[PDB]
Amino acid sequence: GRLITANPVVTKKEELVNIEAEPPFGESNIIIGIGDKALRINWYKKGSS
Amino acid sequence: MRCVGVGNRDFVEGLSGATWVDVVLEHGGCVTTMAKNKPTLDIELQKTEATQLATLRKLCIEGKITNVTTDSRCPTQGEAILPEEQDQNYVCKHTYVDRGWGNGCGLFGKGSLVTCAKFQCLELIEGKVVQHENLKYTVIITVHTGDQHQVGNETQGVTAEITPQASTVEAILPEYGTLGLECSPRTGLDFNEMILLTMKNKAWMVHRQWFFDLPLPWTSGATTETPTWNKKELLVTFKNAHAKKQEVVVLGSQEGAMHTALTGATEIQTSGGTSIFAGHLKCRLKMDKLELKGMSYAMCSNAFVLKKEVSETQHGTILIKVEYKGEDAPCKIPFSTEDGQGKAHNGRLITANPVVTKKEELVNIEAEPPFGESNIIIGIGDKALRINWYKKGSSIGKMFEATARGARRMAILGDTAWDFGSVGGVLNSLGKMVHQIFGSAYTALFSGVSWIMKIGIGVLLTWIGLNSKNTSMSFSCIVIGIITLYLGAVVQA
Amino acid sequence: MKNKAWMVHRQWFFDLPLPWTSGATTETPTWNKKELLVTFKNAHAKKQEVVVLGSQEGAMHTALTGATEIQTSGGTSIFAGHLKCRLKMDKLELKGMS
Amino acid sequence: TQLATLRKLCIEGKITNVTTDSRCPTQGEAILPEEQDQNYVCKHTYVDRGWGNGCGLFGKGSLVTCAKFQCLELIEGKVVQHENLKYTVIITVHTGDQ
Amino acid sequence: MKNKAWMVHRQWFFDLPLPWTSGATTETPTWNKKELLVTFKNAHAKKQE
Amino acid sequence: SVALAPHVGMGLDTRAQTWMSAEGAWRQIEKVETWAFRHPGFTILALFLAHYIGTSLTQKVVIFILLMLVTPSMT
Amino acid sequence: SVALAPHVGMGLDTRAQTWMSAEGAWRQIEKVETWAFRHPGFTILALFLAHYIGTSLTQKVVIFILLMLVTPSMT
Amino acid sequence: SVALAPHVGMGLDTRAQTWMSAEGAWRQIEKVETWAFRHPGFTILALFLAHYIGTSLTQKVVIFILLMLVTPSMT
Amino acid sequence: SVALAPHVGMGLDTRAQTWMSAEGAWRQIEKVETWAFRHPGFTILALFLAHYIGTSLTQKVVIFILLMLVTPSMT
Ligand SMILES: *[C@@H]1O[C@H](CO)[C@@H](O[C@@H]2O[C@H](CO)[C@@H](O)[C@H](O)[C@H]2NC(C)=O)[C@H](O)[C@H]1NC(C)=O
Ligand SMILES: *[C@@H]1O[C@H](CO)[C@@H](O[C@@H]2O[C@H](CO)[C@@H](O)[C@H](O)[C@H]2NC(C)=O)[C@H](O)[C@H]1NC(C)=O
Ligand SMILES: *[C@@H]1O[C@H](CO)[C@@H](O[C@@H]2O[C@H](CO)[C@@H](O)[C@H](O)[C@H]2NC(C)=O)[C@H](O)[C@H]1NC(C)=O
């Protein structure tokens, strides 16, 4: 899975930040943290290469 | 919820590595996971409910008709027009009738005629798609602890909510550690291409493109006070009679016809908030943290007594109900399966650690016996209770039964069934890939074919294969015909 | 039907998958082949639930396509028929021949 | 003029008094006392029974669930006696009136 | 039967044609398949007995 | 009509019994049999058509079966 | 069901328009077309079956048409 | 007497309805069918016996049908 | 009736003598013999059928025995 938004930096920590990413064609789990507190998003992208 | 005797329990044993097993959970039946030195679990997907539903299109079934109008023209004068044709509320059709001096027209011949009547639908059917990320998969996980009351008890277990927002959930089992569920709620039933219509207090799950192809007048489904019905000509029928006047009447309540047209469509609960039964989930079981209860206890030094006769599950598994008459209440139940004429330990427990918790409490011990006559010992010493049992059938019987069960699992589930009980595997993944390709190719060919028509095409393919000189084509036709016959004989579960 | 009658060929009305009666104007009828309406769903093969299939009015209206309609207001009046009257005009005189 | 009702199908149906009897797998077919009642409609199915269902022996057990049946609306086919017809031929005179 | 009892194969017992009921020690039960012990005969075509 | 297009043969197959699976499994076969037994004359016409188009017995049988199935169902 | 056996093709034909003549004349054709356009994959399978059973072009076309008509209608 | 020898073969017959004609017409065939369903292996045994004795299809078929009619009835 | 389907051949054999073993061992053979003795002409008919359907002597005798066994028990 690629990441379109080149560098996801949080500018202020009060304003919520949005990221655009390109997941793989299979089911994929996206992790946006470092530890076990990491928010985990799983997406299933229907289609074929 | 600790189902035994459900007849679809689908034993799953083994772990790939890093202590996890990939399993697929279906509404009908459980999964029984029994690894080495881990508590055994009888897991299943209890219910899936959609929290919020978005109405996408609402057909109507009954119809009332009012305000019938009619305009006519003389034969040559052309088409007749009512000012109310442009009104979307009214439905009407042009017909040709004969006019003359008796009808007030000065010129004989066939004249145009249009008769427009009001239309409103008394009852409606209300198809409402489900957002794929407002689901809630409720997996109920029992502990298979050998309690007294849980033999088939459907109200005892641990509940874990699986949603696409938070798929990975660690369900904390009581005194057995925290099982790890890494699930995949996004690949079950493809609710995107489903519409889930509601009829009236009876909802159904229907494939998306069929609800768009129902010959009933629809609406936008915008929760508007006054709807605008499209293709209203499907209900109202315009009879030209003897080609002298046109009369319009409603065709009637389409409730029975729609109920008939819903054959083969899985039903669904709609009481209160909607609760989708008849679904499957692909939770992957991570059993890193599962401990056993009594690994620290001692062995029972006293005898046991049978309180209910042993019985055989449909899957060949016996169940044992013993009561421990001894003072050391926290303990372990010694359990050795002595074979016929030999002390070979051929039978194995399906309860990981048969443990007595209290002197008064009974305990249910589940164990798979050998295919022959086999005694079973529940105690220590010469005063040990010895259960005698004769499980019938052969290992070839279990092999055939498992092959048929797996073929059915592949029939309903498709490619996903390759991932049921699939502990890692590299050959298994290649088999899943080739099955994905062939299943997509087959589903493209045989979509929308009936119960009997599938069998007919399968017989035709088999006959073509038998009479094909080309060895490759003959083999391909025979192989595809056999599986087509199977699918025709198993379709519409 | 209900205030809408039709002319149907005899052997088709005997072949409608709907539960019949004797038609004896009896207070309590005895419906035969009642299994056509009620549907028995075995669910997950653990319990059986029975529900009615619903009003067959629209399906019957559809099944009546190609069947000539008929008036039923008041006493029945069969339109859409043919007769073979043979005209004997022996006694027909003209008005103004004189 | 006069119509004789010959058979009356029904179109809607209401269902009441749902009953159910079950047997353990080997014990055979289940019976409700109300099967012999022509008013009720019902079908035998096989369900799984066990210690959670109260049965002592695991397996698939028979089950029959009989429910009352009455038809709210009916369709009332009524044949016509071929000698109670009345063909009304209207004969104009074509006199050249205004 | 009365003071005599036999061991019969259960499937054969279920197969033998005789009117049967639930056996729930209820006076005046209802016998399923009770047509086996009644015969209806036509006196030519006049009547029914 | 609506009943003429049942929701059968679609890709949604699960464990639970579908709506009227048992009743709807054989309705088409039953209606074909009823039409065939109520119109026995068409059987010989179907045989005639199959026999003057099927060069081989397999083609004859295929055409005869297809004609027997299609005509009541197009009714 | 009831709708699966329309009162068409019977011997009672008169001058007056039958019940839903105009609507019921083309319902079968319309449903066949809708099923065919919603399941385009089956077209090539029907062509395959017709081609490996029809020795002559006329037999091929007859079998292909019959397969195209029967399968949606048996649905 | 015993039911094994019913009074069905005697030449005496008349217009009037015989005693228990409706049941006794199909009683024997019903018994044969239920015996065949109960014990399906003897179908395989009779197939083998007919195949190893009947040279012609007529011979094999007649032996198979007679053998499947005798065993349920001679029991 | 129920007497036509005796409890013979069910796999429940034991050392104890069964109910009416002596009579039920030979009731069937007695029935066959008495029918074949009260209706001699069927012997001629069965001989004709066996001769004209049995190519070999073993096939002839098998057919003749099966015909003389099925008919008394199909009465
Ligand atoms: C459609 O028909 C209805 C009734 O059939 C008409 O309703 C009339 O409404 C006026 C006032 O709005 C009343 O004075 C009449 O008594 C009503 N007629 C009745 C009750 O028969 C209505 O006007 C017609 N047209 C429209 C456009 O609705
Ligand atoms: C299923 O489990 C529940 C809870 O474990 C059982 O309910 C218990 O029943 C016993 C006696 O039957 C009572 O002494 C307990 O107080 C109950 N606990 C509750 C209600 O929380 C139930 O009996 C079990 N079996 C079934 C068939 O439900
Ligand atoms: C069928 O169900 C009805 C109601 O569902 C039962 O009616 C009961 O009748 C008795 C007296 O006849 C009343 O005391 C009850 O209150 C009624 N029940 C209600 C109103 O729910 C009826 O008994 C049932 N059985 C039969 C054979 O009709």
Side-chain angles (χ1 to χ4, degrees):
Chain A
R2 194 178 57 195
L3 180 64
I4 296 170
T5 314
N7 205 30
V9 295
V10 176
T11 76
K12 193 175 287 293
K13 90 180 160 57
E14 193 282 308
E15 297 176 353
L16 72 165
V17 67
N18 46 8
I19 300 97
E20 180 193 17
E22 196 272 332
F25 284 149
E27 183 174 3
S28 178
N29 307 349
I30 283 165
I31 294 90
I32 320 184
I34 52 166
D36 303 62
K37 266 148 186 159
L39 182 146
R40 185 177 295 268
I41 299 292
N42 53 345
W43 196 274
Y44 174 82
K45 194 169 153 182
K46 70 185 274 211
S48 51
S49 169
Chain B
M1 61 201 75
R2 183 59 204 281
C3 74
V4 177
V6 76
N8 200 30
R9 67 183 300 176
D10 286 330
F11 289 100
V12 167
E13 187 191 15
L15 293 170
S16 199
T19 315
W20 63 261
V21 57
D22 194 357
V23 70
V24 169
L25 312 180
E26 305 166 40
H27 264 77
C30 298
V31 304
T32 294
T33 64
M34 53 167 290
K36 294 177 181 177
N37 275 3
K38 310 284 188 192
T40 75
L41 279 75
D42 192 77
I43 302 169
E44 58 180 353
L45 165 80
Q46 184 181 2
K47 57 181 162 187
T48 80
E49 55 264 14
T51 64
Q52 291 179 336
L53 284 182
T55 186
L56 178 136
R57 200 201 284 264
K58 56 179 59 152
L59 302 173
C60 65
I61 286 162
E62 306 203 20
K64 190 168 70 67
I65 196 159
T66 60
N67 291 126
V68 174
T69 53
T70 290
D71 171 50
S72 307
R73 301 265 190 188
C74 277
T76 310
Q77 262 171 292
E79 279 180 336
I81 172 170
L82 293 174
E84 291 91 0
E85 288 185 352
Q86 306 320 275
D87 204 310
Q88 192 63 41
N89 275 286
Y90 297 0
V91 60
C92 64
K93 183 185 80 173
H94 294 245
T95 199
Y96 276 51
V97 309
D98 51 351
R99 302 277 305 286
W101 299 7
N103 292 18
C105 179
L107 185 84
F108 292 135
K110 290 177 70 65
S112 181
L113 184 144
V114 62
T115 180
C116 300
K118 197 178 219 294
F119 184 77
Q120 65 183 177
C121 288
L122 306 171
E123 297 295 326
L124 72 165
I125 191 166
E126 198 167 20
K128 40 171 66 197
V129 300
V130 54
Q131 287 301 341
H132 203 286
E133 277 174 340
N134 287 339
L135 278 149
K136 189 185 288 185
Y137 289 83
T138 291
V139 191
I140 188 166
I141 300 156
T142 191
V143 298
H144 203 283
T145 186
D147 206 340
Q148 51 169 342
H149 281 113
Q150 65 182 177
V151 170
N153 205 345
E154 291 182 353
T155 188
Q156 211 174 343
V158 193
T159 292
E161 268 83 16
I162 300 310
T163 61
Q165 284 74 357
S167 79
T168 296
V169 168
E170 277 215 341
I172 55 172
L173 271 60
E175 294 292 327
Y176 286 181
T178 71
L179 180 137
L181 283 158
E182 179 171 356
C183 301
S184 70
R186 211 71 68 103
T187 185
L189 263 70
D190 202 21
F191 285 117
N192 180 298
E193 283 171 330
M194 287 169 72
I195 294 195
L196 196 153
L197 75 166
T198 58
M199 181 46 97
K200 55 196 190 165
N201 74 49
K202 319 197 58 177
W204 285 274
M205 287 186 283
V206 175
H207 175 224
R208 186 180 183 84
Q209 199 54 58
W210 183 76
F211 180 72
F212 276 48
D213 288 356
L214 285 179
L216 283 194
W218 65 83
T219 313
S220 65
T223 66
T224 303
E225 299 86 332
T226 174
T228 75
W229 307 95
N230 285 310
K231 291 175 71 175
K232 296 174 299 320
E233 296 88 1
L234 297 167
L235 282 179
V236 305
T237 177
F238 284 96
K239 184 174 72 67
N240 197 20
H242 282 117
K244 67 189 288 184
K245 78 162 186 307
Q246 193 178 10
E247 182 63 27
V248 56
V249 298
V250 170
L251 195 154
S253 176
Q254 297 297 109
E255 169 171 16
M258 180 63 72
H259 268 254
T260 295
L262 286 162
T263 182
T266 62
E267 208 186 311
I268 190 168
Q269 186 66 256
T270 183
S271 70
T274 184
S275 66
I276 309 162
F277 279 84
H280 81 77
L281 187 56
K282 193 210 194 76
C283 279
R284 195 186 75 204
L285 306 173
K286 295 188 71 171
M287 286 177 303
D288 288 327
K289 306 296 181 71
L290 288 195
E291 277 190 324
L292 282 79
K293 194 178 177 43
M295 277 287 105
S296 176
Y297 299 153
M299 300 297 279
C300 288
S301 64
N302 201 359
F304 282 90
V305 59
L306 267 187
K307 274 321 181 56
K308 174 147 210 209
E309 76 160 326
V310 294
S311 79
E312 181 186 358
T313 307
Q314 303 182 185
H315 305 279
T317 298
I318 208 175
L319 277 75
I320 297 167
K321 191 135 177 166
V322 296
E323 175 180 0
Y324 168 70
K325 301 191 300 297
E327 291 179 351
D328 49 351
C331 181
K332 295 178 185 176
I333 303 167
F335 189 100
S336 64
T337 291
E338 189 187 63
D339 208 327
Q341 293 179 356
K343 292 153 199 54
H345 200 307
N346 201 13
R348 73 167 194 297
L349 282 168
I350 305 183
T351 305
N353 206 31
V355 63
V356 292
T357 311
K358 299 171 209 319
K359 171 52 161 78
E360 183 177 0
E361 289 282 69
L362 281 76
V363 286
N364 299 282
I365 309 175
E366 184 165 6
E368 199 177 51
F371 279 99
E373 167 198 8
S374 73
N375 300 75
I376 286 177
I377 295 89
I378 321 289
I380 191 165
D382 198 17
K383 291 329 168 178
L385 182 141
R386 166 155 48 207
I387 284 150
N388 173 246
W389 184 257
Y390 181 43
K391 170 171 161 187
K392 65 177 70 175
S394 65
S395 183
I396 302 169
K398 189 150 79 73
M399 186 79 53
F400 277 16
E401 213 169 77
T403 287
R405 180 167 43 74
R408 293 182 189 274
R409 202 167 41 216
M410 289 185 49
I412 297 89
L413 269 178
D415 53 353
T416 303
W418 275 95
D419 266 340
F420 179 85
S422 74
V423 287
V426 64
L427 189 145
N428 194 355
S429 166
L430 193 146
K432 174 187 184 177
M433 182 178 177
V434 64
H435 180 251
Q436 261 186 338
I437 293 169
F438 278 135
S440 174
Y442 188 96
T443 303
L445 292 172
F446 277 85
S447 56
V449 176
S450 304
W451 167 273
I452 188 167
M453 200 64 208
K454 202 158 288 170
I455 292 171
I457 294 173
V459 165
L460 199 66
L461 281 190
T462 299
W463 183 251
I464 280 167
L466 290 181
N467 290 10
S468 180
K469 293 179 178 180
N470 216 6
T471 298
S472 44
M473 172 66 82
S474 67
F475 165 86
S476 286
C477 283
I478 297 171
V479 164
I480 193 164
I482 296 291
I483 73 170
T484 298
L485 292 176
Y486 183 96
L487 293 178
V490 183
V491 69
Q492 308 193 222
Chain C
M1 181 46 97
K2 55 196 190 165
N3 74 49
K4 319 197 58 177
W6 285 274
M7 287 186 283
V8 175
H9 175 224
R10 186 180 183 84
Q11 199 54 58
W12 183 76
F13 180 72
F14 276 48
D15 288 356
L16 285 179
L18 283 194
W20 65 83
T21 313
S22 65
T25 66
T26 303
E27 299 86 332
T28 174
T30 75
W31 307 95
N32 285 310
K33 291 175 71 175
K34 296 174 299 320
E35 296 88 1
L36 297 167
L37 282 179
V38 305
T39 177
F40 284 96
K41 184 174 72 67
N42 197 20
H44 282 117
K46 67 189 288 184
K47 78 162 186 307
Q48 193 178 10
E49 182 63 27
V50 56
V51 298
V52 170
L53 195 154
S55 176
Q56 297 297 109
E57 169 171 16
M60 180 63 72
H61 268 254
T62 295
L64 286 162
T65 182
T68 62
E69 208 186 311
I70 190 168
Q71 186 66 256
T72 183
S73 70
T76 184
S77 66
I78 309 162
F79 279 84
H82 81 77
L83 187 56
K84 193 210 194 76
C85 279
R86 195 186 75 204
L87 306 173
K88 295 188 71 171
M89 286 177 303
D90 288 327
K91 306 296 181 71
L92 288 195
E93 277 190 324
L94 282 79
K95 194 178 177 43
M97 277 287 105
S98 176
Chain D
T1 64
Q2 291 179 336
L3 284 182
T5 186
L6 178 136
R7 200 201 284 264
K8 56 179 59 152
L9 302 173
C10 65
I11 286 162
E12 306 203 20
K14 190 168 70 67
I15 196 159
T16 60
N17 291 126
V18 174
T19 53
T20 290
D21 171 50
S22 307
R23 301 265 190 188
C24 277
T26 310
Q27 262 171 292
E29 279 180 336
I31 172 170
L32 293 174
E34 291 91 0
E35 288 185 352
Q36 306 320 275
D37 204 310
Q38 192 63 41
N39 275 286
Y40 297 0
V41 60
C42 64
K43 183 185 80 173
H44 294 245
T45 199
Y46 276 51
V47 309
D48 51 351
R49 302 277 305 286
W51 299 7
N53 292 18
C55 179
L57 185 84
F58 292 135
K60 290 177 70 65
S62 181
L63 184 144
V64 62
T65 180
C66 300
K68 197 178 219 294
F69 184 77
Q70 65 183 177
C71 288
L72 306 171
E73 297 295 326
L74 72 165
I75 191 166
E76 198 167 20
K78 40 171 66 197
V79 300
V80 54
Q81 287 301 341
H82 203 286
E83 277 174 340
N84 287 339
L85 278 149
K86 189 185 288 185
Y87 289 83
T88 291
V89 191
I90 188 166
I91 300 156
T92 191
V93 298
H94 203 283
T95 186
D97 206 340
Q98 51 169 342
Chain E
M1 295 193 285
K2 310 184 170 18
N3 53 22
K4 290 185 289 293
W6 299 271
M7 267 181 286
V8 295
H9 198 245
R10 172 178 317 210
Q11 181 49 39
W12 172 85
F13 176 101
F14 292 167
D15 270 305
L16 63 87
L18 287 181
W20 57 272
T21 199
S22 52
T25 183
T26 291
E27 290 177 349
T28 68
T30 61
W31 303 98
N32 193 352
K33 198 177 289 292
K34 60 169 93 60
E35 63 192 345
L36 303 171
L37 273 294
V38 301
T39 186
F40 313 94
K41 194 181 76 67
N42 276 106
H44 317 117
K46 308 178 198 142
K47 60 186 68 180
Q48 189 72 45
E49 309 193 2
Chain F
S1 62
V2 184
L4 291 197
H7 183 269
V8 67
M10 317 313 291
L12 304 175
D13 199 0
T14 57
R15 293 318 198 109
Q17 203 184 312
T18 70
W19 175 250
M20 294 197 298
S21 84
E23 316 211 353
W26 296 78
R27 59 163 41 108
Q28 291 293 349
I29 300 167
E30 205 151 59
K31 85 154 188 51
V32 171
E33 288 180 354
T34 56
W35 180 89
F37 277 115
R38 290 288 160 284
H39 301 251
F42 186 78
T43 286
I44 71 172
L45 179 71
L47 266 188
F48 160 59
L49 288 192
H51 173 86
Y52 282 169
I53 307 167
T55 60
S56 45
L57 185 87
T58 175
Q59 301 173 84
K60 283 195 205 171
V61 164
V62 167
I63 295 177
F64 170 55
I65 292 292
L66 288 196
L67 288 171
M68 277 283 102
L69 302 166
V70 65
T71 62
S73 191
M74 298 294 283
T75 189
Chain G
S1 62
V2 184
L4 291 197
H7 183 269
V8 67
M10 317 313 291
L12 304 175
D13 199 0
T14 57
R15 293 318 198 109
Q17 203 184 312
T18 70
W19 175 250
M20 294 197 298
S21 84
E23 316 211 353
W26 296 78
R27 59 163 41 108
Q28 291 293 349
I29 300 167
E30 205 151 59
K31 85 154 188 51
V32 171
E33 288 180 354
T34 56
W35 180 89
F37 277 115
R38 290 288 160 284
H39 301 251
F42 186 78
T43 286
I44 71 172
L45 179 71
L47 266 188
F48 160 59
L49 288 192
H51 173 86
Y52 282 169
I53 307 167
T55 60
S56 45
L57 185 87
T58 175
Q59 301 173 84
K60 283 195 205 171
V61 164
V62 167
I63 295 177
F64 170 55
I65 292 292
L66 288 196
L67 288 171
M68 277 283 102
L69 302 166
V70 65
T71 62
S73 191
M74 298 294 283
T75 189
Chain H
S1 72
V2 192
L4 295 181
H7 183 284
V8 304
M10 305 303 115
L12 277 301
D13 47 12
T14 185
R15 295 288 187 191
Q17 186 64 255
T18 49
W19 164 267
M20 295 178 70
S21 160
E23 294 87 2
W26 293 93
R27 149 179 297 131
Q28 200 70 22
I29 310 189
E30 185 69 30
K31 182 189 70 65
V32 161
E33 182 186 1
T34 191
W35 186 99
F37 288 165
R38 284 168 57 190
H39 311 290
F42 191 75
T43 298
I44 294 169
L45 182 59
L47 284 175
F48 161 86
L49 285 172
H51 174 66
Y52 266 74
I53 305 168
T55 58
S56 175
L57 276 296
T58 304
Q59 296 220 345
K60 189 182 74 65
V61 165
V62 69
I63 294 171
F64 170 68
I65 199 72
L66 263 57
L67 196 61
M68 289 297 290
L69 261 52
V70 164
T71 313
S73 67
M74 195 65 35
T75 182
Chain I
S1 83
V2 72
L4 292 182
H7 186 257
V8 173
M10 311 306 291
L12 301 174
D13 208 0
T14 44
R15 193 52 57 93
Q17 181 168 351
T18 57
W19 169 265
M20 282 176 66
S21 85
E23 295 87 11
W26 292 91
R27 288 185 293 111
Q28 272 298 338
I29 279 155
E30 292 294 329
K31 163 183 97 205
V32 162
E33 301 291 18
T34 192
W35 184 91
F37 177 80
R38 298 304 184 190
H39 307 249
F42 189 87
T43 292
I44 284 175
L45 171 75
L47 285 172
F48 165 76
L49 284 174
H51 183 245
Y52 275 72
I53 209 69
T55 47
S56 62
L57 187 44
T58 179
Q59 289 164 352
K60 179 260 178 178
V61 70
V62 161
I63 289 290
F64 170 61
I65 292 169
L66 288 177
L67 284 171
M68 291 299 291
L69 280 191
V70 64
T71 310
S73 191
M74 286 308 272
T75 188

